[PDB]
Amino acid sequence: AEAGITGTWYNQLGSTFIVTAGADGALTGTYESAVGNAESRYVLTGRYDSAPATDGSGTALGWTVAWKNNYRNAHSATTWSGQYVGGAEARINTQWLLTSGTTEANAWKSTLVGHDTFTKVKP
Amino acid sequence: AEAGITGTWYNQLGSTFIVTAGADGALTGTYESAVGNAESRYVLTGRYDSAPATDGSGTALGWTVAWKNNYRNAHSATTWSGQYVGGAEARINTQWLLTSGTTEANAWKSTLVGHDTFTKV
Amino acid sequence: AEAGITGTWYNQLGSTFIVTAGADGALTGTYESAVGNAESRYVLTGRYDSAPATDGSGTALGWTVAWKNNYRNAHSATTWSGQYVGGAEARINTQWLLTSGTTEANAWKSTLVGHDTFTKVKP
Amino acid sequence: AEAGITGTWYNQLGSTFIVTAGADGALTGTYESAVGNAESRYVLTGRYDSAPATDGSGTALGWTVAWKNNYRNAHSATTWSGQYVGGAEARINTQWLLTSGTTEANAWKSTLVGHDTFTKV
Ligand SMILES: N=C1N[C@H]2[C@H](CS[C@H]2CCCCC(=O)O)N1
Numbered sequence A, C: 001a002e003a004g005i006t007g008t009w010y011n012q013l014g015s016t017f018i019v020t021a022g023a024d025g026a027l028t029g030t031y032e033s034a035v036g037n038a039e040s041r042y043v044l045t046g047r048y049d050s051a052p053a054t055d056g057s058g059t060a061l062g063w064t065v066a067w068k069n070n071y072r073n074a075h076s077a078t079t080w081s082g083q084y085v086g087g088a089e090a091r092i093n094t095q096w097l098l099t100s101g102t103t104e105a106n107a108w109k110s111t112l113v114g115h116d117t118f119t120k121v122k123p
Numbered sequence B, D: 001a002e003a004g005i006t007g008t009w010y011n012q013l014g015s016t017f018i019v020t021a022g023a024d025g026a027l028t029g030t031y032e033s034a035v036g037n038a039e040s041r042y043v044l045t046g047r048y049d050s051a052p053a054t055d056g057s058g059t060a061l062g063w064t065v066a067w068k069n070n071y072r073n074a075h076s077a078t079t080w081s082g083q084y085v086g087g088a089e090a091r092i093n094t095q096w097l098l099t100s101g102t103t104e105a106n107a108w109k110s111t112l113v114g115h116d117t118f119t120k121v
């Protein structure tokens, strides 16, 4: 459901995710991180399944944030891959990958992996 | 480096990805996979660092593909996170996460992880 | 601390992890999973940092379970990588990789990734 | 397949791993890395499927290395999860997780993920 996803969400670290789910399966919005070499809002773009299953299955989605805005550039990008689970307590459960640009030599230590859970607050 | 991300790339599995990199960090294009519950092209959208470091570092990027098009709906989405390295042989080294929408019961087994390397060859 | 780690632990899915931390950095014990093509106990082996930092840092560790015992064989193995955090509420926070043996053709869909949190019950 | 996992393997980064595979699924040996806060050999322990499927499937395995030896202590541990494929050119394809002990504050950035391919060459 696009409307289900559309809104303001927050995760356990205190980050803000403002997203709009478009009818063609598009996701656009802004991300505000509570951690890292990150200041202010960052543009996010993603995709979700706009025709999910009619049973109790989550809606698959994913989005990317490149950590560069007009104030900072961390030379890194995070992709979140997960599912939206609707109900009274709507959640987005994700696993993420954070890759930093590196020299060829340090490429083996370029990617962090973790997981985030988002709770919806507003539309 | 420079507009070099724009182009048609191919990975080890025969998948093709056509992308346009916008001056300000946007990535847009299509993806056509050769594996999984996939048939035809799919829209892709992502972001990349449009001001990378001057030292010899790669360009951080990432993109998403929801596997639903007019033909098929696999109820899943893959995100690729990596970095582009230009030169005589430009390549995009990535790690990816593929999440399938599941019931809560099967949520523990909802995400696959792998790696793909793309070249313009 | 070996004694801190040694004991009975359980995670959010209802699985049991019985482990002994040896003085040389070794971990041995048994795992009982509440999910998958898994029945009864399985042998686990792992390693942990037996000389961790004197500040509030967790203790790094990891272990493997090959899902084959005398009753079942799932042809798969899981490795858990994480940290032990001591206190009154001792936890082991992990991220895991589950690889299934596959044909070359299906190798791209051989590995699942997830995360588990363990709470200690007994010594 | 068979006792073929036993041996000395090498990965793309120059690391060497010497392993003995026990009849019942145990893996024991040493690892010597060429990258990170590492100096000399480290003990490794793991498990593998000692009764793999007869169809053309790989042998599931995994092992752990805590990065502490008599010389160095990096306060970290890496786990590799993958599968062995025998043949004219045997190889072990793996994905790994490297966790560093951190304060709670930095727990979000405690784990690196990558992939390594080992051959006997
Ligand atoms: N809300 C979250 N913040 C951290 C995790 C995943 S990405 C990350 C922020 C990184 C900030 C910029 C950086 O350090 O590169 N979730």
Ligand SMILES: N=C1N[C@H]2[C@H](CS[C@H]2CCCCC(=O)O)N1
Binding pocket: B011, B013, B015, B033, B034, B035, B036, B037, B038, B067, B074, B076, B078, B096, B098, B114, B116, C108
């Ligand atoms: N080129 C790639 N194709 C496979 C891997 C990761 S994404 C995947 C295709 C999956 C298609 C949809 C599905 O089976 O659910 N990389």
Ligand SMILES: N=C1N[C@H]2[C@H](CS[C@H]2CCCCC(=O)O)N1
Binding pocket: B108, C011, C013, C015, C032, C033, C034, C035, C036, C037, C038, C067, C074, C076, C077, C078, C096, C098, C116
């Ligand atoms: N306690 C847990 N059980 C599942 C996760 C990670 S490994 C897994 C069990 C798999 C059981 C055997 C299998 O299906 O291959 N944690």
Ligand SMILES: N=C1N[C@H]2[C@H](CS[C@H]2CCCCC(=O)O)N1
Binding pocket: A108, D011, D013, D015, D033, D034, D035, D036, D037, D038, D067, D074, D076, D078, D096, D098, D114, D116
């Ligand atoms: N052969 C490999 N070496 C690096 C990757 C994953 S494990 C890593 C070595 C890390 C050494 C310890 C450290 O820096 O903390 N594979």
